[PDB]
Amino acid sequence: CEASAFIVNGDKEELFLERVDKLIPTEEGLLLENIFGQRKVIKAKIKRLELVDHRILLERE
Amino acid sequence: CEASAFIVNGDKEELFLERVDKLIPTEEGLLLENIFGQRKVIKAKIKRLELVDHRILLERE
Numbered sequence: 001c002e003a004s005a006f007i008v009n010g011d012k013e014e015l016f017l018e019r020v021d022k023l024i025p026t027e028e029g030l031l032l033e034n035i036f037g038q039r040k041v042i043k044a045k046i047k048r049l050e051l052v053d054h055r056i057l058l059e060r061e
Numbered sequence: 062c063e064a065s066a067f068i069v070n071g072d073k074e075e076l077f078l079e080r081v082d083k084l085i086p087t088e089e090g091l092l093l094e095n096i097f098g099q100r101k102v103i104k105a106k107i108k109r110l111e112l113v114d115h116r117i118l119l120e121r122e
Binding site: 022 | 062063064081082083084085086096106107108109110111112113117
């Protein structure tokens with residue numbers, strides 16, 4: 001199943017995109033596409049995937 | 062949901078670890094832990110996540 005992506009700044013988490021299907025690193029940033037076909041790009045690295053708990057944790061660069 | 066990780070070498074795909082739960086980028090490589098508690102480290106980057114299809118695609122170095 002689709003997992004939610006969050007931006008993590010220290011102890012703060014902000015929801016970035018729900019129900020992410022694809023995550024594709026590009027030269028412009030991480031490109032995320034959710035199950036409804038909505039796309040968002042973010043200059044970030046993956047801090048961690050926690051897939052049982054439906055979480056993609058991203059940190060801005 | 063948990064995803065299987067595959068190594069993509071050119072056009073070839075090779076199963077690396079089944080049902081991955083955690084994926085944590087480290088200085089020594091991507092640390093993967095599956096739902097059975099099995100752990101593996103690999104010097105690789107994420108080519109792409111396909112979370113609906115339960116796939117993590119990795120490329121070495």
